[PDB]
Coordinates of all heavy atoms in Angstrom, one line a residue:
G5 N 10.2 2.4 -17.0 CA 10.8 1.2 -17.5 C 11.7 0.5 -16.5 O 12.7 -0.2 -16.9
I6 N 11.4 0.7 -15.2 CA 12.2 0.2 -14.2 C 11.4 -0.8 -13.3 O 10.1 -0.5 -13.1 CB 12.8 1.4 -13.3 CG1 13.9 2.2 -14.1 CG2 13.3 0.9 -12.0 CD1 14.0 3.6 -13.8
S7 N 12.1 -1.8 -12.8 CA 11.4 -2.8 -12.0 C 11.4 -2.4 -10.5 O 12.5 -2.3 -9.8 CB 12.3 -4.1 -12.0 OG 12.1 -4.8 -13.3
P8 N 10.2 -2.1 -10.0 CA 10.0 -1.6 -8.6 C 9.8 -2.8 -7.7 O 9.2 -3.9 -8.1 CB 8.6 -0.9 -8.7 CG 7.9 -1.6 -9.7 CD 8.9 -2.1 -10.8
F9 N 10.5 -2.8 -6.4 CA 10.3 -3.9 -5.5 C 9.0 -3.5 -4.6 O 8.2 -4.4 -4.5 CB 11.5 -4.0 -4.6 CG 11.4 -5.0 -3.5 CD1 11.4 -6.3 -3.8 CD2 11.3 -4.5 -2.2 CE1 11.3 -7.2 -2.8 CE2 11.2 -5.4 -1.1 CZ 11.1 -6.7 -1.4
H10 N 9.0 -2.3 -4.2 CA 7.8 -1.9 -3.4 C 6.6 -1.6 -4.1 O 6.6 -1.1 -5.2 CB 8.2 -0.7 -2.4 CG 9.4 -1.0 -1.4 ND1 10.7 -0.7 -1.8 CD2 9.5 -1.6 -0.3 CE1 11.5 -1.0 -0.9 NE2 10.8 -1.6 0.1
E11 N 5.4 -1.9 -3.5 CA 4.2 -1.5 -4.0 C 4.1 0.0 -3.8 O 3.5 0.7 -4.7 CB 3.1 -2.1 -3.2 CG 2.8 -3.6 -3.5 CD 2.4 -3.7 -4.9 OE1 1.3 -3.2 -5.3 OE2 3.2 -4.3 -5.8
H12 N 4.4 0.5 -2.7 CA 4.3 1.9 -2.5 C 5.2 2.2 -1.3 O 5.7 1.3 -0.7 CB 2.9 2.3 -2.2 CG 2.1 1.4 -1.4 ND1 2.1 1.4 0.0 CD2 1.2 0.3 -1.7 CE1 1.3 0.5 0.5 NE2 0.7 -0.1 -0.5
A13 N 5.5 3.5 -1.1 CA 6.2 4.0 0.2 C 5.1 4.6 1.1 O 4.4 5.5 0.6 CB 7.3 4.9 -0.1
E14 N 5.0 4.2 2.4 CA 3.9 4.4 3.3 C 4.2 4.9 4.6 O 4.8 4.2 5.5 CB 3.1 2.9 3.4 CG 2.2 2.7 4.5 CD 1.4 1.3 4.5 OE1 0.7 1.0 3.5 OE2 1.6 0.6 5.5
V15 N 4.1 6.1 4.9 CA 4.5 6.8 6.1 C 3.3 7.0 7.0 O 2.3 7.7 6.6 CB 5.0 8.2 5.6 CG1 5.8 8.9 6.7 CG2 6.0 8.0 4.4
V16 N 3.4 6.5 8.2 CA 2.2 6.5 9.1 C 2.6 7.2 10.3 O 3.6 6.9 11.0 CB 1.6 5.1 9.4 CG1 0.5 5.2 10.3 CG2 1.4 4.4 8.1
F17 N 1.9 8.2 10.8 CA 2.2 9.1 11.9 C 0.9 9.7 12.6 O -0.1 9.9 11.9 CB 3.2 10.2 11.5 CG 2.6 11.2 10.5 CD1 2.1 12.4 10.9 CD2 2.5 10.8 9.1 CE1 1.5 13.3 10.0 CE2 2.0 11.7 8.3 CZ 1.5 13.0 8.7
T18 N 1.0 9.9 13.9 CA 0.0 10.7 14.5 C 0.2 12.2 14.3 O 1.3 12.7 14.6 CB 0.1 10.4 16.1 OG1 -0.3 9.0 16.3 CG2 -0.8 11.3 17.0
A19 N -0.8 12.9 14.0 CA -0.7 14.4 13.7 C -1.5 15.2 14.7 O -2.6 14.8 15.1 CB -1.1 14.6 12.4
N20 N -1.0 16.3 15.1 CA -1.7 17.4 15.8 C -2.1 17.1 17.1 O -3.0 17.8 17.7 CB -2.9 17.9 15.0 CG -2.5 18.2 13.5 OD1 -3.2 17.7 12.5 ND2 -1.6 19.1 13.3
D21 N -1.5 16.1 17.7 CA -2.0 15.5 19.0 C -1.9 16.6 20.1 O -2.7 16.5 21.1 CB -1.3 14.3 19.4 CG -2.2 13.3 20.4 OD1 -3.2 13.8 20.9 OD2 -1.7 12.2 20.6
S22 N -0.8 17.4 20.1 CA -0.6 18.5 21.1 C -0.9 19.8 20.6 O -0.6 20.8 21.2 CB 0.9 18.4 21.6 OG 1.2 17.3 22.5
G23 N -1.6 19.9 19.5 CA -1.9 21.1 18.8 C -1.5 21.1 17.3 O -0.8 20.3 17.0
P24 N -2.2 22.0 16.6 CA -1.9 22.1 15.1 C -0.4 22.2 14.8 O 0.3 23.0 15.4 CB -2.8 23.2 14.6 CG -3.7 23.5 15.7 CD -3.1 23.1 17.0
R25 N 0.2 21.5 13.9 CA 1.6 21.6 13.4 C 1.4 21.5 11.9 O 0.5 21.0 11.3 CB 2.5 20.5 13.9 CG 2.5 20.4 15.4 CD 3.2 21.6 16.0 NE 3.4 21.4 17.4 CZ 2.6 21.9 18.4 NH1 1.5 22.5 18.1 NH2 2.9 21.6 19.7
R26 N 2.5 21.9 11.3 CA 2.8 21.8 9.9 C 3.7 20.7 9.6 O 4.9 20.7 10.4 CB 3.2 23.1 9.2 CG 2.3 24.3 9.3 CD 2.6 25.5 8.3
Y27 N 3.6 19.8 8.7 CA 4.3 18.6 8.4 C 4.7 18.6 6.9 O 3.9 18.7 6.0 CB 3.4 17.4 8.7 CG 2.9 17.3 10.0 CD1 1.7 17.8 10.4 CD2 3.7 16.6 11.0 CE1 1.3 17.7 11.7 CE2 3.4 16.4 12.3 CZ 2.1 17.0 12.6 OH 1.6 17.0 14.0
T28 N 6.0 18.4 6.7 CA 6.6 18.1 5.4 C 7.1 16.6 5.5 O 7.9 16.2 6.4 CB 7.7 18.9 5.1 OG1 7.3 20.3 5.0 CG2 8.3 18.6 3.8
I29 N 6.6 15.9 4.6 CA 7.0 14.5 4.4 C 7.9 14.4 3.3 O 7.5 14.7 2.2 CB 5.9 13.5 4.3 CG1 4.9 13.5 5.4 CG2 6.4 12.0 4.1 CD1 5.5 13.2 6.7
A30 N 9.2 14.1 3.4 CA 10.3 14.0 2.4 C 10.6 12.5 2.2 O 10.6 11.7 3.0 CB 11.5 14.8 2.7
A31 N 10.7 12.1 0.8 CA 10.9 10.7 0.5 C 11.9 10.6 -0.7 O 11.8 11.6 -1.6 CB 9.6 9.9 0.1
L32 N 12.9 9.8 -0.6 CA 13.9 9.5 -1.5 C 13.7 8.2 -2.0 O 13.8 7.2 -1.3 CB 15.3 9.7 -0.9 CG 16.5 9.4 -1.8 CD1 16.4 10.3 -3.0 CD2 17.7 9.5 -1.0
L33 N 13.5 8.0 -3.4 CA 13.1 6.8 -3.9 C 14.2 6.0 -4.8 O 14.8 6.6 -5.6 CB 11.9 6.9 -4.9 CG 10.8 7.6 -4.3 CD1 9.6 7.6 -5.4 CD2 10.2 7.1 -3.0
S34 N 14.3 4.7 -4.4 CA 15.1 3.8 -5.4 C 14.3 2.6 -5.6 O 13.2 2.3 -4.9 CB 16.4 3.4 -4.7 OG 17.2 4.4 -4.5
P35 N 14.6 1.7 -6.6 CA 13.7 0.7 -7.0 C 13.4 -0.4 -5.8 O 12.4 -1.0 -5.7 CB 14.3 0.1 -8.3 CG 14.8 1.3 -8.9 CD 15.5 2.0 -7.7
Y36 N 14.6 -0.6 -5.1 CA 14.5 -1.6 -4.0 C 14.7 -1.0 -2.6 O 14.9 -1.7 -1.6 CB 15.5 -2.7 -4.2 CG 15.2 -3.7 -5.1 CD1 15.3 -3.5 -6.5 CD2 14.9 -5.0 -4.7 CE1 15.0 -4.5 -7.3 CE2 14.5 -6.0 -5.6 CZ 14.6 -5.7 -6.9 OH 14.2 -6.6 -8.0
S37 N 14.5 0.3 -2.5 CA 14.7 1.0 -1.2 C 14.0 2.4 -1.2 O 13.9 3.1 -2.2 CB 16.3 1.3 -1.0 OG 16.6 1.9 0.2
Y38 N 13.6 2.8 0.0 CA 13.3 4.3 0.1 C 13.7 4.8 1.5 O 13.8 3.9 2.4 CB 11.8 4.5 -0.2 CG 10.8 3.9 0.7 CD1 10.4 4.6 1.7 CD2 10.4 2.6 0.4 CE1 9.4 4.0 2.6 CE2 9.4 2.0 1.3 CZ 9.0 2.8 2.4 OH 8.1 2.2 3.3
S39 N 13.9 6.0 1.5 CA 14.1 6.7 2.8 C 13.1 7.8 3.0 O 12.7 8.4 2.1 CB 15.5 7.1 3.0 OG 15.8 8.1 2.0
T40 N 12.6 8.1 4.3 CA 11.7 9.2 4.4 C 12.0 9.9 5.7 O 12.5 9.3 6.6 CB 10.2 8.6 4.4 OG1 9.4 9.7 4.6 CG2 10.0 7.6 5.6
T41 N 11.7 11.1 5.7 CA 11.8 11.9 7.0 C 10.8 12.8 7.1 O 10.0 13.2 6.2 CB 13.2 12.7 7.0 OG1 13.5 13.1 8.4 CG2 13.3 13.9 6.1
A42 N 10.6 13.4 8.3 CA 9.6 14.4 8.6 C 10.2 15.7 9.1 O 11.1 15.7 9.9 CB 8.6 13.9 9.5
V43 N 9.7 16.8 8.6 CA 9.9 18.2 9.2 C 8.6 18.6 9.9 O 7.7 18.8 9.2 CB 10.4 19.1 8.1 CG1 10.8 20.5 8.8 CG2 11.7 18.5 7.4
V44 N 8.7 19.1 11.1 CA 7.5 19.4 11.8 C 7.8 20.7 12.4 O 8.7 20.9 13.1 CB 7.3 18.4 13.0 CG1 6.0 18.9 13.9 CG2 7.1 17.0 12.6
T45 N 6.9 21.7 12.0 CA 6.9 23.1 12.5 C 5.6 23.5 13.3 O 4.5 23.0 12.9 CB 7.3 24.0 11.4 OG1 6.2 24.1 10.5 CG2 8.5 23.5 10.6

């Protein structure tokens, strides 16, 4: 029942280019903002 500004949150990255890795994509959502980070192992 909340008014969203964004259509979606959209994280684009190149993966595995120097070898296989594991990726966690973390996102924190608000109606007019988001923040995202990556953990790469």
Side-chain angles (χ1 to χ4, degrees), residues 5-25 27-45:
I6 289 150
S7 283
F9 178 70
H10 302 94
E11 281 300 296
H12 43 84
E14 157 179 304
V15 190
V16 183
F17 64 100
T18 294
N20 308 129
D21 202 350
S22 283
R25 307 285 189 265
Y27 300 91
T28 297
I29 300 302
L32 174 63
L33 308 186
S34 296
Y36 280 80
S37 185
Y38 63 91
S39 69
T40 181
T41 198
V43 182
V44 178
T45 66

